[PDB]
Ligand binder design. Structure first.
Ligand SMILES: O=P(O)(O)OC[C@H]1O[C@@H](O)[C@H](O)[C@@H](O)[C@@H]1O
Ligand SMILES: O=P(O)(O)OC[C@H]1O[C@@H](O)[C@H](O)[C@@H](O)[C@@H]1O
Ligand SMILES: OC[C@H]1O[C@@H](O)[C@H](O)[C@@H](O)[C@@H]1O
Ligand SMILES: OC[C@H]1O[C@@H](O)[C@H](O)[C@@H](O)[C@@H]1O
Ligand SMILES: [Ca+2]
Ligand SMILES: [Ca+2]
Length: 899
């Protein structure tokens, strides 16, 4: 009676009080909070790692998979076949492989070579190599993952200690070993921790399973947490399984006041000193030795075996946990203790057999008790989440010590139910192992992988290689030439139309002028005053005037009548209504010029479609409308394209600006060609500004090489089917449509919005330049993206938002590259013309897409630099619009008219 009370006095420390157990519980409860927080997670010892598993099996799972189970006490590989659809129910055949204390403690390479060899043999014995069966990986160690098929080892635990693995991705490490074998092909689709596998398994049979617990070589647990609580995972919808990794509870020294010298000594001799402390007082890997450490400490004080101490009772690991168990059996309890203590050399007194066996209870009871305190903190967290007052949940379990020890299970549940009363908990023991559960995870993981494979295959067509970009640059140049050569100009797609502007501002332009800006997003009328010499200055006023789309696609009569009306009102506005002022007309469309004041509208582009305009001279068309009104009189000195207007605006300040570019509703470019190359205009003196009209590039098929199904659909439904193919893969008026069309397709395939094509998604023009630009902002957050989308009328989840943003990126990126390859061709021609080996030139730019988009310009500039390394281009943005440049052209126009 005192012997018992004798040891209960010695091992007093290892006798935890309920109030104490509650304390620890409260402590872990706080460790969980810190672990899940984005602010404190970096310092927490309890990792609370996300698993990317959002629900237990639903029953829809089916297929043939292979599972690997490394990290437990046995390396086992299994094959799980499941398919209710047809009729088949869950079936699985497993095999166990040996793993010597050599591989486990060797180099990661040696370890993964073994795992790859064992999997090979397994597939051979079943001759299933030919099948690309999905592989699930149950790796019972702490792992960092940003996705289910990635697992970076944080640190080894238990018996493993292989070099070159920590901090690496075991998936990649394993994939290498297999590939190095060339024997077969693996498709590792997921990596799960055993606590998650165990939970998945028990969940299959009990749809109330919300916890996975393991108590074997090591101890850990996982539970279903609310996504809105997992800070380190963007989303607030539903739940995800968190792998607590509580074995490291108190590694920051939060359980020093509970750890004994026996614990510390056990640690100082461990493989991983300082870590997994909480686990070192529980798991069956340490129970035995923790006891043999006291037996020695007792004998060393004559309290046992008559103070005798054999070399065996001193040798490490000579007292297995197996002993600790057999010695606690109810039947042959003490009888067993005798045989054991006997082989230990020491002479077992039938009184010793009693003293010993009791020690075992104390140690083996502390474990069961501790685990009950932490698991209790988890159940309390679940109860808190549900809001309910009571709690009903199932808990999956597995692990030697639990599965094979006479009293553990028993005492464990007891203390538990005692600690958490307001809850009804069922403990289901995984009889099958992790295999079933891993397979259940692999099924869904794989389901999402094919979806992904398909999405990527499609998007891959929007990816151009540097080599593809050089071809486009090449083609651009070939077409540039066909258009300049009078013999081939007749059937060239890039018309290279001359503008009849032969020099950038000289600095003598002086006067007052009116200007028109038609073609972009805003039709506006301006008044510009230029003063040079001493006081060189420019003063301009403008006013925007709408233009109903009806008029825009009405008749040339109403269109130009409307324009003149606006010109009138502005003349009043500025007051200057009276004299005969010279006017520059910026008409952003392809015109055939004979002189600075004659433009035959070759064809309409963008969204304009007025009747009886194509084929006429726009100057005239305007002149007439003016005569008809009879309210004033003007001097139309010039007609100008916005690209040329832009170039002049920027060249007014920057003398090296010899290129103009526009990337807004439509896209076009212009530059200064050598008069000797412009075979369409007599002379070979000086230079001339060439309005390329490069939007038509590809209208002869030269781009059908990289155009996609979505590009064709967008073209096929445009106002000008067949024309302006290049500009239609670049400008803000079309980008959106390419996207919409890609989205509708993904939706029909059931990859977006639950497969529902909404009315909004069917509305053309829905994706404005302004939206494409917000959605791609880098300062944006997923929550915000989803918000924007919902505002548009699209009911999108967070997963949806991610895919939409991606799609927008692929499309917008390709647009910038194609545009860069185009500009690259231009600058390199200007360099070859000037026979240079290096050319410095700046480009004048304008266009809403260019100005608002967060990445277009950057990726564009980058691409030009990469395709034309012999030119140092600079892009200067026009902030005053074309107007300034139109007036600066009108000035010369007049100067040459007066002369
Ligand atoms: O207690 P152990 O022998 O160490 O293993 C306990 C459990 O570990 C997991 O890693 C395995 O996936 C399970 O199959 C096993 O039941
Ligand atoms: O993006 P956009 O609306 O097409 O604008 C791009 C540019 O178009 C030209 O027609 C105007 O001369 C510019 O002032 C304007 O900045
Ligand atoms: O194998 C059960 C548990 O053992 C522990 O030592 C590891 O830290 C966990 O990753 C694992 O879940
Ligand atoms: O608006 C910018 C460009 O758009 C193109 O579609 C027009 O054909 C060009 O004349 C214009 O420079
Ligand atoms: Ca979250
Ligand atoms: Ca010429």
């Amino acid at each position: 009676d005192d012997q018992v009370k004798k040891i209960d006095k010695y091992l007093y420390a290892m006798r935890l009080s309920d109030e104490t157990l509650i304390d620890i519980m409260t402590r872990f409860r706080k460790e969980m909070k810190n672990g899940l927080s984005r602010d404190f997670n970096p310092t927490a010892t309890v990792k609370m790692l996300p698993t990317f598993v959002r629900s237990i099996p639903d029953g829809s799972e089916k297929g043939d998979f292979i599972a690997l189970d490394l990290g437990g006490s046995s390396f086992r590989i299994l094959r799980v076949q499941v398919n209710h659809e047809k009729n088949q129910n869950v079936h699985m055949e497993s095999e166990v492989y040996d793993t010597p204390e050599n591989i486990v403690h060797g180099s990661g390479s040696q370890l993964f070579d073994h795992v790859a060899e064992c999997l090979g043999d397994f597939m051979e014995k079943r001759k299933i190599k030919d099948k690309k069966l999905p592989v699930g990986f149950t790796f019972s160690f702490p792992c960092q993952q940003s996705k289910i098929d990635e697992a970076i080892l944080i640190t080894w635990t238990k018996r493993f200690k292989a070099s070159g693995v920590e901090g690496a991705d075991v998936v990649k490490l394993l994939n290498k070993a297999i590939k190095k074998r060339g024997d077969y092909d693996a498709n590792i689709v997921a990596v799960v921790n055993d606590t998650v596998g165990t939970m998945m398994t028990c969940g299959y049979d009990d749809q109330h399973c919300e916890v996975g617990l393991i108590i074997g070589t090591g101890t850990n647990a996982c539970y279903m947490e609310e996504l809105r609580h997992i800070d380190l995972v963007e989303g607030d919808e539903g739940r995800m399984c968190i792998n607590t990794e509580w074995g490291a509870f108190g590694d920051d020294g939060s359980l020093e006041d509970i750890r004994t010298e026996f614990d510390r000594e056990i640690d100082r001799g461990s493989l991983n000193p300082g870590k997994q402390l909480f686990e070192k007082m529980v798991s069956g890997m340490y129970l035995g030795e923790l006891v043999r450490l006291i037996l020695v400490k007792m004998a060393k004080e004559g309290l046992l075996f008559e103070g005798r101490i054999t070399p065996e009772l001193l040798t490490r690991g000579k007292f297995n946990t197996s002993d600790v168990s057999a010695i606690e059996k109810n039947k042959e309890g003490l009888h067993n203790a005798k045989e054991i203590l006997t082989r230990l050399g020491v002479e077992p007194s039938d009184d010793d057999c009693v003293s010993v066996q009791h020690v075992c209870t104390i140690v083996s009871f502390r474990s069961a008790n501790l685990v009950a305190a932490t698991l209790g903190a988890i159940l309390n967290r679940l109860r808190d989440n549900k809001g309910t007052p009571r709690l009903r949940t199932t808990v999956g379990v597995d692990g030697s010590l639990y599965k094979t020890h006479p009293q553990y299970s028993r005492r464990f549940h007891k203390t538990l139910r005692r600690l958490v009363p307001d809850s009804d908990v069922r403990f289901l023991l995984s009889e099958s192992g992790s295999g079933k559960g891993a397979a259940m995870v692999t099924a869904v993981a794989y389901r999402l992988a094919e979806q992904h494979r398909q999405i990527e295959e499609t998007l891959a067509h929007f990816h151009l290689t540097k080599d593809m970009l050089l071809e486009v640059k090449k083609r651009m140049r070939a077409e540039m030439e066909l258009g300049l050569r009078k013999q081939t100009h007749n059937n060239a797609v890039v018309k290279m139309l001359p503008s009849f502007v032969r020099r950038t501002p000289d600095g003598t332009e002086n006067g007052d002028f009116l200007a028109l800006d038609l073609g972009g997003t805003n039709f506006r009328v301006l008044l510009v005053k230029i003063r040079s010499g001493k006081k060189r200055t420019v003063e301009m006023h403008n006013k925007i005037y709408a233009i109903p789309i009806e008029i825009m696609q009405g008749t040339g009569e109403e269109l130009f009548d409307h324009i003149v009306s606006c010109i009138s009102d502005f003349l009043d506005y500025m007051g200057i209504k009276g004299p005969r002022m010279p006017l520059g007309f910026t008409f952003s469309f392809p015109c055939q010029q004979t002189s600075l004041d004659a433009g035959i509208l070759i064809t309409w582009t963008k969204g304009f479609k007025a009747t009886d305009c194509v084929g006429h001279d726009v100057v005239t068309l305007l002149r007439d409308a003016i005569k008809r009104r009879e309210e004033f009189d003007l001097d139309v000195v010039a007609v100008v394209n916005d690209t040329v207007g832009t170039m002049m605006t920027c060249a007014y300040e920057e003398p090296t600006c010899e290129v103009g570019l526009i990337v807004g509703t439509g896209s076009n470019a212009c530059y200064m060609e050598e008069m000797k190359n412009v075979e369409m205009v007599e002379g070979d003196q000086g230079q001339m500004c060439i309005n390329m009209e490069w939007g038509a590039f590809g209208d002869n098929g030269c781009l059908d090489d990289i155009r996609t199904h979505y590009d064709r659909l967008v073209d096929e439904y445009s106002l000008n089917a067949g024309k302006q193919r290049y500009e239609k893969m670049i400008s803000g008026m079309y980008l959106g449509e390419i996207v919409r069309n890609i989205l509708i397709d993904f939706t029909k395939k059931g990859f977006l919005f639950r497969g529902q094509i909404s009315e909004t998604l069917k509305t053309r023009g829905i994706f404005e330049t302004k939206f494409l630009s917000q959605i791609e902002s880098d300062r944006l957050a997923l929550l915000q993206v989803r918000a924007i989308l919902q505002q548009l009328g699209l009911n999108s989840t967070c997963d949806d938002s991610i895919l939409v943003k991606t799609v927008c990126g692929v499309v917008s990126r390709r647009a910038a590259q194609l545009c860069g390859a185009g500009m690259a061709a231009v600058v390199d021609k200007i360099r070859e013309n000037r026979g240079l080996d290096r050319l410095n030139v700046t480009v004048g730019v304008d266009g809403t897409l260019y100005k608002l988009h967060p990445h277009f310009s950057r990726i564009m500039h980058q691409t030009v630099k990469e395709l034309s390394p012999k030119c140092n281009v600079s892009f200067l943005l026009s902030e005053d619009g074309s107007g300034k440049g139109a007036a600066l052209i009108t000035a010369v126009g007049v100067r040459l008219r007066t002369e």
